[PDB]
């Protein structure tokens with residue numbers, strides 16, 4: 165996250181850190197708890213991943229330094245990538261992880277609701293992007309989970325900033341005109357969480373953009389509401 169601030173314990177209890185374990189153990193991407201054995205994340209995170217055997221999902225983490233050799237984690241039973249996915253920039257950047265066991269919900273780990281059926285006309289004005297990603301293009305994974313409030317921009321405006329790409333209604337965009345706050349490497353797969361009537365909803369999945377926090381180049385996110393039929397079908 166560029167231009168963010170440190171989160172505190174329990175602040176974003178749906179946020180998980182997905183680690184790979186080979187050839188070293190490291191944070192790969194973010195994800196969101198959406199059900200008792202289900203993480204929603206970005207398909208592009210799994211480039212070159214041979215199988216789910218080399219993944220671990222850690223919930224209830226604030227600082228990456230908390231993770232020790234005896235820290236509990238969930239194995240991944242299945243990786244479900246959208247059948248139309250090809251590359252992040254070309255859309256369908258969405259995947260589900262089915263965990264090997266269930267997540268017991270507490271103040272530090274619980275699910276986030278999807279955008280509600282019937283809420284098409286809701287205008288989200290309180291949206292936050294979170295993660296352990298880089299603070300700029302040439303950086304490293306951050307220790308403490310970062311947060312930044314980012315305004316949505318219309319798809320019409322977003323398309324004008326990305327004339328070499330097809331911005332579709334399966335995407336949404338968020339960023340400031342003068343940049344300064346955005347997601348960056350290591351944040352993909354995590355949530356764009358928006359609060360409406362004091363309930364948080366998973367509006368976007370961090371996906372891609374041109375650089376990080378550059379002026380007039382908003383972050384591009386998977387538009388979760390356009391995938392509810394797909395998510396519900398896979399998780400039923």
Ligand SMILES: NCc1cccc(-c2cccc(C(=O)Nc3ccccc3CC(=O)O)c2)c1
Nearest residue numbers: 208209347348349350351352371372373375376
């Ligand atoms: N501001 C837009 C924005 C939003 C999110 C990520 C980036 C960004 C920047 C530079 C490099 C990368 C990258 O190599 N990613 C990658 C590739 C394969 C697997 C996992 C990942 C991590 C990931 O995507 O987080 C991503 C940019």
Ligand code: NA
Nearest residue numbers: 391392393394
């Ligand atoms: Na769908």
